[PDB]
């Protein structure tokens, strides 16, 4: 004798995969020969011991490894290309380098971005291409965008891609180049056919007070050698408590009607050990409820989260039916947190 309530579709995190560069670089690698002010305390503070750099000489770029990862994931998940309704890509480096067979003769470019080109390469003939940017938190944004699209019935399969070719913006005459690294991540979100998986709640907010701290700027090297050519460089010049990430997690947990003790595991962005430790304690997460993964990969901008999520799944730290929280910060600055009810997530 009453009407029926409309229900948002549940969002299933179906599959995930990452593609890292084949070659690793130690802290004593000659690449940092021109870098001054390299102390042993510097390395220990940031928790990075190895890092990955794309090697274009052997076909490693932001696009080729995405095709590989995407094709691997599509085949492993038995997902037909024409069944993908939306493709959301992110790449923090404004400089792209490869467009595969779509635009074969196009090399270094500022535009177009990746979504449309990749969809043509992969044959996603029915996919709406989108390219979003939230820097280190772009993977969470793309899940948020995909989830809302699925919830409102505007898409049933969304392919998410984060490809960070940040090494092409590192000033190797400055120690700022010692932290960040390259990497790729691909994830598939679909309409849930049951209650196994869903994005329970999320919270996104931004604060531009310290915008000029971390920027991409056209400038000369910090310690140039010889005839120095201007380039687009990651620039960190400026002269604090990490509370916004906990704020985002509290907001997300409250929207989901949960508390920190209801969460089985946590996945944080990987800027530095002392920041992950600050975020964790700010929300009440114990050390055994999260991992530090920057040690062997470096800070892969938007890929650190999906890579940490993958290792958590692959290593059995995250299991089906677990409730997890994913959170992180990003230059801008922005902050995102997500409360996920996870089911079976295909790792490939």
């Amino acid at each position: 004798n009453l009407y029926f309530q409309g229900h948002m579709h549940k969002v299933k995190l179906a599959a995930i995969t990452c593609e890292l560069p084949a070659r690793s670089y130690e802290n004593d690698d000659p690449v940092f020969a021109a870098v001054p002010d390299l102390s042993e305390s510097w390395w220990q503070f940031w928790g990075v011991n190895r890092r990955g750099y794309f090697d274009p000489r052997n076909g490693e770029n932001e696009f080729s490894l995405v095709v590989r990862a995407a094709e691997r994931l599509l085949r492993s998940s038995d997902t037909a290309p024409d069944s993908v309704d939306m493709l959301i890509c992110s790449a923090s480096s404004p400089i792209m380098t490869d467009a595969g067979d779509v635009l074969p003769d196009l090399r270094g470019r500022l535009y177009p971005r990746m979504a449309n080109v990749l969809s043509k390469q992969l044959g996603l003939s029915r996919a709406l291409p989108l390219d979003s940017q939230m820097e280190c938190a772009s993977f969470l944004l793309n899940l948020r965008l995909a989830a809302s699209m699925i919830r409102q019935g505007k898409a049933e399969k969304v392919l998410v891609v984060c490809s960070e070719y940040i090494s092409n913006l590192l000033d190797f005459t400055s120690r700022t180049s010692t932290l960040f690294a390259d990497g790729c991540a691909v994830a598939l979100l679909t309409r849930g056919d049951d209650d196994s998986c869903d994005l329970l709640a999320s919270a996104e907010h931004s604060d531009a007070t310290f915008y000029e701290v971390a920027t991409g700027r056209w400038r000369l090297p910090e310690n140039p050698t010889g005839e120095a050519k201007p380039r687009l460089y990651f620039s960190l010049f400026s002269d604090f408590v990490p509370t916004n990430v906990p704020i985002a997690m509290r907001r997300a947990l409250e929207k989901a009607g949960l508390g920190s003790d209801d969460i089985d595991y946590f996945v944080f962005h990987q800027p530095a050990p002392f920041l992950v430790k600050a975020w964790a304690e700010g929300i009440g997460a114990r050390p055994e409820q999260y991992q530090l993964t920057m040690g062997d990969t470096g800070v892969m901008i938007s890929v650190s989260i999906p890579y940490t999520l993958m290792t958590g799944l692959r290593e059995g730290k995250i299991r089906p039916g677990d409730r997890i929280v994913m959170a992180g910060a990003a230059t801008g600055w922005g902050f995102a947190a997500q409360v996920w009810q996870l089911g079976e997530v295909l790792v490939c």
Binding site: Y111, D131, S148, Y211, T215, R231
Partner: protein, 280 residues
């Protein structure tokens, strides 16, 4: 998606380029940067809608310009949305950027996100200050400079279409690209080159695509983007910024629903989004 108010601020300096894809378009001069025009455009929309900057829940930006964005003309990232948040004082707002998306596609995605997250005041901004991009002197193509501010109220009910260009259906339209400048010698040099091959049938094919896509919503009046001077009075066109006058005209005529159609030069398609309008 409801349009609460529209704001626009274009440079008075018009520059004419010849070619099949040429025209007379506004162009930022000297050391001018985008925020000089974006901020007044935003404040115009906020004032029109009686919305204070504190009330803004979301800011989404669209700007291809690789420099001349803010006071420090050399900064390219993070995108202009974050500087805007700072000067506005939109401390409650979330900020991100949709890069080379069309405005129609962005309004559709944003309407989805913002409605799903319960936002009430959303700000979508499109702007250019393209001193750092060399125009395509062969075809005449060039981006119009200026700023457009759309203050929106999400509803989640916006419809979307991604349609093909008109003309010969078998013609492979060569898309726009912006290659990086390989020989940068001074920080002031252009950072990229606009490359849109000369295609004399493109301006009409885009117009034909607009009319075709509008056929999916025959009950709606519609507004459009004009990226090319061909067939236009005086050869003038404002690109995406043409929407401001058309939107305001729809407001004067007290329309409560509209179809907004964009042209995506990168994907060589047309994209439409259905919208609601606020009355007087």
């Amino acid at each position: 998606m409801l349009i609460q108010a529209v704001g626009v601020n274009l440079p008075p300096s018009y520059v004419c380029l010849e070619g099949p894809l040429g025209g007379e378009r506004p162009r930022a001069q000297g050391d001018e940067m985008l925020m000089q025009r974006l901020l007044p455009a935003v404040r115009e929309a906020l004032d029109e809608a009686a919305v204070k900057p504190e009330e803004i829940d979301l800011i989404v930006g669209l700007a291809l310009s690789p420099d001349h964005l803010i006071e420090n003309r050399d900064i390219m990232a993070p995108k202009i949305g974050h500087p805007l948040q700072k000067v506005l004082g939109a401390n409650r707002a979330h900020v991100f950027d949709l890069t080379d998306s069309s405005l129609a596609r962005a309004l559709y995605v944003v309407d989805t996100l913002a409605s799903d997250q319960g936002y009430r005041n959303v700000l979508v901004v499109r702007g250019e200050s393209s001193q750092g991009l060399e125009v395509d002197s062969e075809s005449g193509f060039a981006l119009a400079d200026g700023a457009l501010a759309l203050l929106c109220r999400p509803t989640g009910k916006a419809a979307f279409r991604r349609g093909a260009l008109g003309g010969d259906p078998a013609q492979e339209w060569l898309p726009l690209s912006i290659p990086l400048n390989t020989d940068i010698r001074q920080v002031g040099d252009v950072k990229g080159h606009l490359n849109l091959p000369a295609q004399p049938g493109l301006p009409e094919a885009v117009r034909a695509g607009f009319t075709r896509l509008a056929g999916d919503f025959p009950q709606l009046n519609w507004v459009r983007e004009e990226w090319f001077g061909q067939g236009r009075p005086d050869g003038r066109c404002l690109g995406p910024f043409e929407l401001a006058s058309q939107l305001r005209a729809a407001q004067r005529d007290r329309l409560d629903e509209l179809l907004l159609i964009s042209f995506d030069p990168f994907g060589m398609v047309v994209e439409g989004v259905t919208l609601e309008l606020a009355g007087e």
